Structure formats: C-alpha cells, structure tokens
C-alpha cells in the first residue's frame, strides 16, 4: 500500500478535481436563468444541506478501507458491487466528450498563436456570409439572421459543423483535432504513468496556474468600460423567482455537479490518504475553495458579458443567444478579439481551459484505474502501465466518434445523460446503501476511530433525513422534465432523445444486473438470499 506522500498533494489534487471546465459556464447560466442575483442563498442552503455531507462521507469511506470504487462496496455491502462498473462507464462516457472539448481548446490555442487573431475579422475562407454582428457599430444595422465572425470561425473551421447535417450525416474526421487529442491523451498518460506521485507532481503545476490566470482575467475585466453593468447584473437579486422549487432543484443539481459525489474519484483519492488524516478540515476547505472559485468564475464571466453588451450598445444577456461549450468559444473569442491585448489573453485563457480540463481528466482516469486495479490485488507487478494504456485506448475509441466533423452534436448529447441523472442516481444508491445497510452508527464509530471524536448530531440527522430526500427530489424533477436540445440552427430529433435515454440507462442498469447476479449466485432460501449480500464479508 502506498500513501499520498505529502498532505498538500491530496488537497491540491482534489481541489483540481473539484474545479471543472463545465464549472465556468454552467454555473453562471444556471444562476442567471434561475434566481438571478439572489441565487446565492438557495445555492448556499442546498450546498450546506446536501453537498458537503456527501463529500465528507465519500472522503471518510475512501480513507477508512483504503480501497478503490468496487472493493469498498464488497467491504461494506457486497449486494451493491455494480456501482464500480457504473462509475467506470460514466467516467468513460464523460471522458469521450471531455477529450473532444480538450482537442477543441487545444486547436483554438494553436490557432491563437499568431499576431492577428484569425476570428477578429470575417475575411477568411471559413467565414462566408453574415458579418453584421460586430463591435462598435458606428452606423445602425440589424438583420434577423446575422452571424458573428467568431461563430463562423468556431462552427466552420474548428468544428467544421457545416459539413454535417446533424447526427445522421456523421462523416469525416478532422486531422488537426485528431493530432490535438492525441497529444492531450499522451500528456495525460505521461501525467499518470507511474502513479499518484507523478499525478501530484503535475497537479502542483497545473492546479496553480488556473488561479493566477483567473486573477489576471478578473483584474483585466474590472478595468474595462461597462464592467459595472455586468457586476450589477450578476448581483441583482430577484426574490420573485425564488417562490418555486425549480430554482432550489437547479441550485442543488449545480452544487452536486460541482462538488461531484459518487463519481468514483473521492474514494480513490482518499484511499491513498493516511489513516490518521483529518478529513473534516480537508472537506470543509475543499468545499469553500470550490465555492469561491465558482463565484469568481461567475463574476469574471458576467463582467466580460457586461463589457461586451456595453460595447454592442445593448442590454446584457442578448449577446448570449447560445448556452453551453460554445458560449466561451463565441463570447470570449469576440471579447479577446476586441481586447487591446488579443494574443496574450487568448493564449492565457486557452491554457486555463486546458488545465481545468486536464485536472479533471487526471482525477477521473486515476479513479478509474484505482477502481479497476483494486478488484484484482494480484496485479501489482507491472500491470499499472498496461491498465493505463488500456483505459487511454478505450477513451480514445469512445471519443473517436465525437472527433468527427459533426462531433459537437454527440458531445452536447453526452454532456447533457453522461453527466446528469445517471450520476445523481449512483450517488443516491451509494448514500442509501451506506446509511441503511452498513449502518449510520457503524459509520459514525468508524469515523470517530479514524479521527478521535464522534461526528456531531447535525451530520448524523442530515445523512438520513435530507441528503437522500434531496437526491430523490432531484431525480424526480429531472425525470419529469424531458430535455429539448438545441445546437446551432438544429433541433434534435425524437430518436436522439431515445438514444440519450438508453445510453444514460446503460450506466445505471449495472446495479440491478449485479443485484440479480448476486441473487442467482448466492445459495440459500428466498429470505436468506438477501441476508448474505447485506452483511459485509469477513476479512
């Protein structure tokens, strides 16, 4: 057994895991759409009530048994051992489109290495038609079908989405994106080549650059004309919108996604921690750091949006007609194109996005490797490198389909599914199993032995009263509202929803399949069949 080494290593690694590429655009969009400037209070309430306890429970579970994401269940509740496979498939599905977005960002960074940014003007070949969506319009002009030059650069040069008619006409593979994703994959492989030592060494570098980059971006945005309007927009309470449970559900989903319990990463990271490590302080520090990082990201995003709106002489939120991964590569692309310092700030922002994605990718791959390996302890000789190569190859094969010209469609389909109810249901299953079958009193005694003091009654009542209730409420709300995907001038067909539902179900279906397998594999009567799978196996 190997430990994390330095305590700061685990803290930095889990902090880098907490910060995500999707935490810079989804959070501002969900705060603007629901709640507004008053969205912080329901967000904080939902956080305190249901996200920090889940993080603490996952950290304690990882630190106690020092096992992966499949053997922990076998140690606590063998009847629910399919959670590891569900976590693995969820991580693979996420990592496909995640590496696709990494390739897109790397291509943007490579193309942003010239003195003149290619998306400033629409005189290039990829930009063809509408060019009336510009900055500082001296003369009045308005067309109902205008397209920004940055949008043309993103959708016709990087993505080349104009060559595909949607999910049906999915043909052609971009070689530049292929090379970028190959370099990203080999960088990831070299980062987690040996084990957690190299992972911590690279986290020490790629987890501090994003923070100074964000500080530079904030100080640049503050000294801009019109940043005050964006500041008021981000800080304009709307208490009338807080009277329905939709905003609370959205805030709970956002905080659960940001903290990320049940992803199979916290358990693996805490498995490498010392037995006498205080997980309470670590969990609290990580939670507050992630919350402040999300708040700063929302601040800078809204400041940039307000500056853009002031430059376009119009109210804010009118320059954000599309929400998602394209929001960055459109709005920020235009902002840096109009910025006095274009190349430097564009490169800095692209490097920030690259690091943000890379940290999460290392965390997920390390968690998957730990989960797969800990099931087979007899492979500690020279199997780590082979397993890393295998998981890298699997991720590459999964992202190959997303690497196509029309890969943005499948990337968005995965991101809306690959990340959603499939992970929340897994987290709910984990929590319900731990707090009903393993026993809340047993877990409290275990964590007291770990630290030295019994946990307070607040967590004891929370884990059994409000966390599963909030999780099941989130699941019910999400399952009762079918999604309506909308990419650039394209409406997802009916069969796309069915495909998304089936791929989302294929992850959650692991738990019932393992339940049936354990029921049909454990000899005994009908009543003793469940009993065997509930009591933990003797060491």
């Amino acid at each position, epitope marked *: 057994r190997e430990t994390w080494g330095k305590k700061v290593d685990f803290l930095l690694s889990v902090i880098g895991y907490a910060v995500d590429l999707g935490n810079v655009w989804r959070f501002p969009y969900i705060c603007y759409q629901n709640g507004g400037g008053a969205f912080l209070l329901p967000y904080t309430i939902m956080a305190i009530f249901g996200g920090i306890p889940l993080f603490y429970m996952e950290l304690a579970l990882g630190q106690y048994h020092r096992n992966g994401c499949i053997s922990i269940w076998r140690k606590i509740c063998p009847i629910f051992k399919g959670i590891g496979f569900a976590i693995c498939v969820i991580a693979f599905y996420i990592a496909s489109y995640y590496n696709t977005i990494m390739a897109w960002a790397l291509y943007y960074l490579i193309s942003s290495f010239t003195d003149q940014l290619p998306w400033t*003007s*629409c*005189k*290039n*070949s*990829w*930009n*063809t*038609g509408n*060019c009336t969506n510009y900055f500082s319009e001296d003369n009045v002009t308005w067309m109902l079908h205008s397209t920004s030059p940055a949008e043309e650069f993103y959708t*016709r*040069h990087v993505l*080349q989405i*104009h*060559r595909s008619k949607g999910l049906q006409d999915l043909g052609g593979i971009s070689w530049q994106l292929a090379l970028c994703i190959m370099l990203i994959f080999t960088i990831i492989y070299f980062s987690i080549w040996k084990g957690v030592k190299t992972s911590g060494k690279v986290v020490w570098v790629t987890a501090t650059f994003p923070y100074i980059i964000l500080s530079i971006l904030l100080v640049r945005g503050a000294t801009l004309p019109g940043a005050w309007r964006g500041v008021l927009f981000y800080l304009k309470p709307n208490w009338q919108k807080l009277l329905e449970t939709g905003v609370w559900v959205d805030a709970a989903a956002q905080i659960f996604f940001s903290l990320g319990p049940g992803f199979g990463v916290l358990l693996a990271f805490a498995s490498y921690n010392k037995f006498n490590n205080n997980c309470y302080q670590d969990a609290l520090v990580t939670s507050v750091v992630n919350c402040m990082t999300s708040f700063v990201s929302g601040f800078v995003i809204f400041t940039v949006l307000g500056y853009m709106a002031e430059m376009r002489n119009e109210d804010v939120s009118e320059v954000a007609k599309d929400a998602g991964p394209s929001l960055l590569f459109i709005t920020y692309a235009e902002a840096i194109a109009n910025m006095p310092a274009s190349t430097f700030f564009a490169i800095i922002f692209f490097l920030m996005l690259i690091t943000l994605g890379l940290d999460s990718t290392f965390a997920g791959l390390e968690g998957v490797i730990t989960a797969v390996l800990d099931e087979f302890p007899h492979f500690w000789s020279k199997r780590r490198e082979w397993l890393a190569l295998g998981v890298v190859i699997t991720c590459f094969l999964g992202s190959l389909i997303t690497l196509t010209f029309g890969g943005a469609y499948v990337v968005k389909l995965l991101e809306e599914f690959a990340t959603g109810p499939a992970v929340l249901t897994v987290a709910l299953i984990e929590a319900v199993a731990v707090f009903w079958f393993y026993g809340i009193t047993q877990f409290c005694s275990d964590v007291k032995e770990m630290l030295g003091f019994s946990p307070g009654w607040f967590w004891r009542i929370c884990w059994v009263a409000i966390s599963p209730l909030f999780l099941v409420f989130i699941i019910c709300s999400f399952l009762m509202s079918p999604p309506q995907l909308w990419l650039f001038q394209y409406n997802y067909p009916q069969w796309s929803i069915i495909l998304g539902y089936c791929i989302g179900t294929s992850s959650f279906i692991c738990i019932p399949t393992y339940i049936t397998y354990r029921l049909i594999i454990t000899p005994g009567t009908l009543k003793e069949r469940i009993v065997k799978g509930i009591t933990p196996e003797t060491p």
Partner: antibody
Amino acid sequence: QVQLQQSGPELVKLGASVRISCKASGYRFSYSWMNWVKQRPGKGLEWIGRIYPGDGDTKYSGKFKGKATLTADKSSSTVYMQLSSLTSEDSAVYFCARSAYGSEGFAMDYWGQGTSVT
Amino acid sequence: DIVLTQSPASLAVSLGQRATISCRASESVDNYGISFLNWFQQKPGQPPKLLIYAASNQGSGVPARFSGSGSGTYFSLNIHPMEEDDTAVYFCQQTKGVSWTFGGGTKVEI
C-alpha cells in the same frame, strides 16, 4: 443589384505611374474582397492581387510586391490601384472585380469594364 | 502559388457536340468541403463572366448548359448543347488562401 464602375483608358510614358479606381455600390462594400486581373492583348488573364476594404490587407501573387500597390477608401466606397515603373511590356487592359462569399469559393462574379493602359 | 494547366489549348467543337474542358492543378483545393476553383468565359473585346462557383454550382445569369463538376485536383466543365455564341475562351482559376493563379485558356472555334 451590384454595379462596378471603372475609369477610362490612360497613356503611360516610360517609367511613369498610373492610378486606377473602381467604384462599388449596391452591396456591402466593406465585406467583399476587391481583386484586379491583367489581360494581355490576345493572351490569357493574369491575377495581380486583392485587397479587403474592411481590413486593408493586400495580397500579391507574382513579383508585383513592389510594382503594384493596392489602396482602399471606405469613405467613397471605392478601391484604388497604383502601379510603378510601367513599361511597354505591360501594355494591357486591367480589370476590376469583387470577390463573392466564402461559401461560393470566392467567386469573381461581378466585373468592371477594363482600362486600356499603354 | 499553385500552377494550373488547361488542356486542350484549342478546341474545335461544332453544334450538337459536347464540349468538355478540364484543367488539373498541382495541390488539392478542398479544405472545408468547398472546391476553391471557378470557371470563367470571355468574348473578344469583352469582360470575362463567371460561369460556375465552387466548381459545382451554377451562377446567377449563367445558362444551365454550362454544367460543371469535379473535386480534389481534377475538374471538368461540359457544355451540352452549345450555340454559335459559345465560341469564347474559358478560364479556370484557383482561389486559395495564399495566392491566386490563372490558367492558359482554351480557344473555342465555332
């Protein structure tokens, strides 16, 4: 409708210079490349360069980097063209054209009238 | 500077006979699904007129008889049927993002 107007023919002595303009109207002047071609008497066409009125970026194909200069004036919605060190070898007719959109492969659909330069 | 060669240099095609003109470049002109090659046609003492853009789509004021097709390196332009007013020189030109070059042209007689 898109109409391109060109000046009449001129006479150039040995080592003199000429100035050729091209008035563009009826469309977005600042969002369409302006390119000029050279047609020798009895011979084929010859591209001479292009210029973007909205950005002022000029591109040269052959050895006309120091021989031909392209300037644009958005105030009057016209594109100018200047040639230096003109001899009898280039005693041809120079045309003016506007490039189309990118999705049409920078089509050279609209032409001018051509000026007979001696 | 992509070099474009047009063959044959002179075509002798009468009424009722298909007139196929093909010019081959040196490098591929397809980058985003559009072939950066256009075909022109000029009469003696007349400005040239665009016939087809992107080597696959007909122009605005161009008769449907000036059909063209091709992708990659080889492009073809066929006129069927053709009249006595088609005895004009046809030029094919590339529109790459670095430099543009013109061909040689075919002298169509009758």
